[PDB]
Enzyme design. Structure first.
Site, PDB file in Angstrom:
ATOM      1  N   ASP A  76       0.775  -1.233   0.000  1.00 54.30           N
ATOM      2  CA  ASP A  76       0.000   0.000   0.000  1.00 54.30           C
ATOM      3  C   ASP A  76       0.830   1.321   0.000  1.00 54.30           C
ATOM      4  O   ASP A  76       1.173   1.863   1.048  1.00 54.30           O
ATOM      5  CB  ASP A  76      -0.965  -0.042   1.181  1.00 54.30           C
ATOM      6  CG  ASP A  76      -2.016   1.073   1.129  1.00 54.30           C
ATOM      7  OD1 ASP A  76      -1.923   1.920   0.205  1.00 54.30           O
ATOM      8  OD2 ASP A  76      -2.944   1.084   1.993  1.00 54.30           O
ATOM      9  N   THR A  77       1.046   1.888  -1.179  1.00 61.28           N
ATOM     10  CA  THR A  77       1.821   3.155  -1.310  1.00 61.28           C
ATOM     11  C   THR A  77       1.186   4.323  -0.598  1.00 61.28           C
ATOM     12  O   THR A  77       1.895   5.258  -0.233  1.00 61.28           O
ATOM     13  CB  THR A  77       2.112   3.539  -2.794  1.00 61.28           C
ATOM     14  OG1 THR A  77       0.899   3.698  -3.554  1.00 61.28           O
ATOM     15  CG2 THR A  77       2.929   2.465  -3.443  1.00 61.28           C
ATOM     16  N   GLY A  78      -0.134   4.255  -0.364  1.00 66.62           N
ATOM     17  CA  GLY A  78      -0.849   5.357   0.295  1.00 66.62           C
ATOM     18  C   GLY A  78      -0.953   5.209   1.804  1.00 66.62           C
ATOM     19  O   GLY A  78      -1.684   5.969   2.464  1.00 66.62           O
TER      20      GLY A  78
HETATM   21  C1  LIG Z   1      -9.332   5.336  -0.310  1.00 64.81           C
HETATM   22  C2  LIG Z   1     -10.287   4.149  -0.411  1.00 64.81           C
HETATM   23  C3  LIG Z   1     -10.832   4.030  -1.848  1.00 64.81           C
HETATM   24  C4  LIG Z   1      -9.595   2.846  -0.050  1.00 64.81           C
HETATM   25  N1  LIG Z   1     -10.609   1.837  -0.021  1.00 64.81           N
HETATM   26  C5  LIG Z   1     -10.731   0.924  -0.976  1.00 64.81           C
HETATM   27  O1  LIG Z   1      -9.948   0.889  -1.943  1.00 64.81           O
HETATM   28  C6  LIG Z   1     -11.931   0.016  -0.752  1.00 64.81           C
HETATM   29  C7  LIG Z   1     -11.653  -1.381  -0.197  1.00 64.81           C
HETATM   30  N2  LIG Z   1     -12.740  -0.099  -1.965  1.00 64.81           N
HETATM   31  C8  LIG Z   1     -14.034   0.225  -1.936  1.00 64.81           C
HETATM   32  O2  LIG Z   1     -14.586   0.586  -0.890  1.00 64.81           O
HETATM   33  O3  LIG Z   1     -14.808   0.126  -3.182  1.00 64.81           O
HETATM   34  C9  LIG Z   1     -16.253  -0.019  -3.193  1.00 64.81           C
HETATM   35  C10 LIG Z   1     -16.910  -0.951  -2.148  1.00 64.81           C
HETATM   36  C11 LIG Z   1     -18.305  -0.890  -2.014  1.00 64.81           C
HETATM   37  C12 LIG Z   1     -18.966  -1.708  -1.093  1.00 64.81           C
HETATM   38  C13 LIG Z   1     -18.242  -2.596  -0.289  1.00 64.81           C
HETATM   39  C14 LIG Z   1     -16.854  -2.671  -0.405  1.00 64.81           C
HETATM   40  C15 LIG Z   1     -16.196  -1.857  -1.331  1.00 64.81           C
HETATM   41  C16 LIG Z   1      -8.772   2.902   1.215  1.00 64.81           C
HETATM   42  O4  LIG Z   1      -9.153   3.420   2.254  1.00 64.81           O
HETATM   43  N3  LIG Z   1      -7.546   2.379   1.110  1.00 64.81           N
HETATM   44  C17 LIG Z   1      -6.592   2.378   2.207  1.00 64.81           C
HETATM   45  C18 LIG Z   1      -6.241   0.927   2.440  1.00 64.81           C
HETATM   46  C19 LIG Z   1      -7.453   0.129   2.863  1.00 64.81           C
HETATM   47  C20 LIG Z   1      -8.021  -0.806   1.980  1.00 64.81           C
HETATM   48  C21 LIG Z   1      -9.156  -1.525   2.375  1.00 64.81           C
HETATM   49  C22 LIG Z   1      -9.679  -1.340   3.662  1.00 64.81           C
HETATM   50  C23 LIG Z   1      -9.085  -0.435   4.552  1.00 64.81           C
HETATM   51  C24 LIG Z   1      -7.971   0.302   4.150  1.00 64.81           C
HETATM   52  C25 LIG Z   1      -5.280   3.120   1.941  1.00 64.81           C
HETATM   53  O5  LIG Z   1      -4.655   2.713   0.728  1.00 64.81           O
HETATM   54  C26 LIG Z   1      -5.379   4.560   1.602  1.00 64.81           C
HETATM   55  O6  LIG Z   1      -4.049   4.827   1.160  1.00 64.81           O
HETATM   56  C27 LIG Z   1      -5.696   5.496   2.724  1.00 64.81           C
HETATM   57  C28 LIG Z   1      -5.465   6.875   2.129  1.00 64.81           C
HETATM   58  C29 LIG Z   1      -5.920   7.925   3.102  1.00 64.81           C
HETATM   59  C30 LIG Z   1      -4.980   8.740   3.717  1.00 64.81           C
HETATM   60  C31 LIG Z   1      -5.426   9.697   4.621  1.00 64.81           C
HETATM   61  C32 LIG Z   1      -6.787   9.829   4.898  1.00 64.81           C
HETATM   62  C33 LIG Z   1      -7.721   9.018   4.254  1.00 64.81           C
HETATM   63  C34 LIG Z   1      -7.272   8.053   3.363  1.00 64.81           C
HETATM   64  N4  LIG Z   1      -4.771   5.274   3.798  1.00 64.81           N
HETATM   65  C35 LIG Z   1      -5.047   5.124   5.091  1.00 64.81           C
HETATM   66  O7  LIG Z   1      -6.159   4.997   5.601  1.00 64.81           O
HETATM   67  C36 LIG Z   1      -3.766   5.188   5.874  1.00 64.81           C
HETATM   68  N5  LIG Z   1      -3.809   6.349   6.751  1.00 64.81           N
HETATM   69  C37 LIG Z   1      -2.715   7.059   7.034  1.00 64.81           C
HETATM   70  O8  LIG Z   1      -1.591   6.810   6.566  1.00 64.81           O
HETATM   71  C38 LIG Z   1      -2.950   8.089   8.093  1.00 64.81           C
HETATM   72  C39 LIG Z   1      -3.562   9.345   7.436  1.00 64.81           C
HETATM   73  N6  LIG Z   1      -1.714   8.106   8.909  1.00 64.81           N
HETATM   74  C40 LIG Z   1      -1.510   8.353  10.260  1.00 64.81           C
HETATM   75  O9  LIG Z   1      -0.451   7.992  10.800  1.00 64.81           O
HETATM   76  O10 LIG Z   1      -2.459   9.001  11.194  1.00 64.81           O
HETATM   77  C41 LIG Z   1      -2.805   8.443  12.472  1.00 64.81           C
HETATM   78  C42 LIG Z   1      -1.876   8.510  13.709  1.00 64.81           C
HETATM   79  C43 LIG Z   1      -1.976   9.567  14.642  1.00 64.81           C
HETATM   80  C44 LIG Z   1      -1.159   9.592  15.787  1.00 64.81           C
HETATM   81  C45 LIG Z   1      -0.249   8.556  16.033  1.00 64.81           C
HETATM   82  C46 LIG Z   1      -0.149   7.484  15.137  1.00 64.81           C
HETATM   83  C47 LIG Z   1      -0.964   7.460  13.994  1.00 64.81           C
HETATM   84  C48 LIG Z   1      -3.316   3.839   6.504  1.00 64.81           C
HETATM   85  C49 LIG Z   1      -2.837   3.935   7.956  1.00 64.81           C
HETATM   86  C50 LIG Z   1      -4.248   2.653   6.340  1.00 64.81           C
END
Ligand SMILES: CC(C)[C@H](NC(=O)[C@H](C)NC(=O)OCc1ccccc1)C(=O)N[C@@H](Cc1ccccc1)[C@@H](O)[C@H](O)[C@H](Cc1ccccc1)NC(=O)[C@@H](NC(=O)[C@H](C)NC(=O)OCc1ccccc1)C(C)C
EC number: 3.4.23.16
Lengths: 99, 99
Positions: free
Chosen positions: A25-27
């Site tokens: 996961d690059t994001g």
């Molecule tokens: C953006 C969405 C389209 C994506 N979801 C999908 O691709 C989904 C499965 N597809 C989908 O939903 O399609 C239709 C569908 C319909 C019905 C049923 C099912 C599906 C997604 O969230 N993808 C994420 C991975 C994922 C996949 C499946 C399920 C759960 C998670 C990351 O790649 C994506 O890169 C996000 C991007 C992002 C960044 C910031 C805000 C919102 C989104 N990253 C993340 O969520 C990451 N967060 C971060 O990197 C945060 C922002 N970092 C952080 O450190 O902050 C917290 C912190 C604070 C204090 C101390 C320590 C930590 C990661 C940890 C998982």
């Protein structure tokens, strides 16, 4: 290897002496694993994504093998629906994006 | 280009007569952008990630350019805090992960 993206980049990993699959996961800055038993000290942290926040247990110095390459680093464990290898371990195994 | 992962893989994109910055995200099935105006009468759509689901707008046949590679596809728009380029567009521009 070289991995294309017509499908989810889901690969086999080994962690805690268990085979799992995880999304490269690059994001994702961090690495987040589905709820499991890991031995060791951890500490509560919270992470944010699309749906909002979650509570996770952070473990440091955890070893993971990803497609045969070893990485050691921090791992967060909690209620994610998918295991996610984030840039913290991806950089250790030499991974890059190419077009 | 070859992008490494010490830092977030942010690039510049052209969409909707606007220049934006966004994240090349191998763990996003779909492309999702922060609130903007786009061409077309949208369809609703649910997407989920860390923290559960959100409702967004889906616009099809949207023209996008990324590092000079054009592509056309669906783009979603809604309450992401960052612009995300998902695998639907990454495959069109010939993007792979490599190690
Ligand atoms: C953006 C969405 C389209 C994506 N979801 C999908 O691709 C989904 C499965 N597809 C989908 O939903 O399609 C239709 C569908 C319909 C019905 C049923 C099912 C599906 C997604 O969230 N993808 C994420 C991975 C994922 C996949 C499946 C399920 C759960 C998670 C990351 O790649 C994506 O890169 C996000 C991007 C992002 C960044 C910031 C805000 C919102 C989104 N990253 C993340 O969520 C990451 N967060 C971060 O990197 C945060 C922002 N970092 C952080 O450190 O902050 C917290 C912190 C604070 C204090 C101390 C320590 C930590 C990661 C940890 C998982």
């Amino acid at each position: 290897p070289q991995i294309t993206l017509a499908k989810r980049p889901l690969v086999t990993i080994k962690i805690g002496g268990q085979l799992k699959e995880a999304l490269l996961d690059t994001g994702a800055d961090d690495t987040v694993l589905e709820e499991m038993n890991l031995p060791g000290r951890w500490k509560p942290k919270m992470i944010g994504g699309i749906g909002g926040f979650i509570k996770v247990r952070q473990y440091d110095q955890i070893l993971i093998e990803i497609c045969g390459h070893k990485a050691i680093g921090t791992v967060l464990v909690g209620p994610t629906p998918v295991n996610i290898i984030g840039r913290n371990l991806l950089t250790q195994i030499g991974c890059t994006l190419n077009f």
